[model samples]
Target: APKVLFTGVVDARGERAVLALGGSLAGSAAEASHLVTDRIRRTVKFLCALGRGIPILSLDWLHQSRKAGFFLPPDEYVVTDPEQEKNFGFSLQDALSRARERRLLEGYEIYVTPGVQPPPPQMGEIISCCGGTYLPSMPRSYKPQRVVITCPQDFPHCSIPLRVGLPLLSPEFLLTGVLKQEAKPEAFVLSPLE
Candidate 1:
């Protein structure tokens, strides 16, 4: 049981749908196949190698393939399929249950923000998928207005990506994922960047 953040993350494969949203749902099937694994496996390995206690929390995830390509905006077109929404609901609620058991995070709270916003890390330590080691883009400093934090209730509307890995020129280039702001004495309260 660990404190899990119920946030929306994207590997480059899912970026286009979030960006150039609005196309036929079935037409966007191509985007669904390309996935950016959260690389929790690697993260867990790092912890084990270091002899840190890693909680046995489930890393549940949800997604949607829309017939329409759309923007992340206005909150009106924020469409999640019934199944996807249901999955997110259950998984997110369970984040608290795991937190209670492991005491990995305090308050059993979730913060929805871009991955970079320097975290007080009550959530967990940051790990990267760039060859199991963090690349330069992570531990992001001088981030400007790129990072954001929102409530657990916000979806499709207040969610975004924490791009991981190296950039590339091909359609197969986005090996991206999210970044966690690892810290000690977790921050129970979350503040947004203005």
Candidate 2:
């Protein structure tokens, strides 16, 4: 099962109306990019939702990063779907833009508050993998984990948030893929799979 591991700011009540920031896990260093991108993506999604005039948010109190951006997985999280799995690729920038445009959110300050914690790399492994409590460099990872939700028995796809292959398991569920649909003859053939 290819699940979408997104980090959006839902209201303090946790509703869909205040959704934002659907990010991608891409880049050379998985550990380096996943968490950072998740943070920024959620931040922007929160801002975008707020920008659209979702009440409960004091736009005056909001301060988003003027330079927000995200890093997607160089490859699909897993090739469960045909088009992406078989033999093809995608436009990274286009995907980002689409995510920015079509992302879902409840739209409120409850979603983006100081209470939210950093998303990835679990806080287990106090041994060598944890960088001796001083650093999270190389193999040290004190960050909490985000684990799988639906585990497929037959087809074991990679389902996780943060970096892959690490033994740490987190509550964070993640998945990614492409959605292809027929376009109307008159409709603009926008970057369908952005």
Candidate 3:
């Protein structure tokens, strides 16, 4: 049975359909074999699932499975929203393929400032799920592969990483990098210094 993780709400009918197929709901992205959501979203669960290279399908996958009285092939039900793909500047299919090739944040150390949006925990989970370490606080000294994630408003609180010349990046560095499974930290640098 596939362990399915869902983003947003799954109606009672959809829930029942999964049970009928011997599938179970996954509480976290790490435990999931598939992710079900209608559209592209930047939520931690969605990003984590993508980072893990799981099949991200539309709700129609469940509906169609129920109709067929068995789990159907997921390839035909993969989520597709060309408008969101254009807006986000990445193709979901290509991203998934890249993720299968390698984990985006593997061997990286990331630190998040206090006032960063989406909260530190959420960002940390995404980092962890992608095979990176999430430091709870800024490191006293910079290491070769360490970076800090901070916003303009939170720059005042980022003195340590700033003084050490560590890469300070916007959250989009994590978001888009994970979405595309590419580590172009240069594109999302938050500070002019680095």
Candidate 4:
């Protein structure tokens, strides 16, 4: 059976994730870049379902860093189905621009509010990855239906009124919420007795 063993914490979520992928889920470390197996693709498909708007991320970094001739360009997560793979998908920046321009919330009209001083760059990236719009200030026209996360402080005077009794998501939840777990680096033994 294919299994993933993580060597390090997948702290870098919603951004480019770096982790090992071996065992039945991936080709050996020594092996050249190849198409992801059917099982692995299924796993990713499930993850996408759970992650809602999370786009199929690229594995270019992994492929690029592989030793010598092993590494190949165009290291991307692929879907065998033609219908599923969009050759002409919108980029993140483009998506954000279009969303704001068109007022297209799709299903989730999320807004990321800054707490206190400026937050880490990765925090913003994670929100973008989760398909949420960043709200630099209080929304003039609307109030968030459900704030996935927010925390206002003294220095940051962006006073947002809570919607009576709705739950307030903490910064930690939003920061780590958009993350996906991946397999570790290893190889599988092939038996020939069949």
* Highest TM-score against the true fold, candidate: 3
The lowest-lDDT stretch of 10 consecutive residues in candidate 3 is 185-194
lDDT of 3 by residue, 117-168 (tens): 9788999999988889999778889787799988877877777777897988
TM-score of 2: 0.18
lDDT of 2 by residue, 20-101 (tens): 2333322212122221111222132222222221211221111121113232233332112234323324433343444445
Ranking by lDDT: 3, 4, 1, 2
Q: Work out how many backbone clashes candidate 1 has.
A: 12
Q: Please tell me which predicted candidate would have the highest lDDT against the true structure.
A: 3
Candidate 4 accuracy as lDDT: 0.32
- The models' CA-based lDDT, in order, is 0.26, 0.22, 0.87, 0.32
* Candidate 4 off by > 4 Å: 1-113, 116-121, 141-148, 152-159, 163-167, 180-194
- Model 2 poorest ten-residue lDDT run: 107-116
Model 1 segments beyond 4 Å from truth? 1-11, 22-63, 68-103, 107-194
Collision pairs in model 3: none
Q: Cα RMSD (Å) per model?
A: 19.3, 20.3, 2.1, 17.4
- Which should have the higher TM-score, number 1 or number 4? 4
What's the TM-score of every candidate structure? 0.20, 0.18, 0.90, 0.33
Question: Ten-residue segment with the worst summed lDDT in candidate 1?
Answer: 166-175
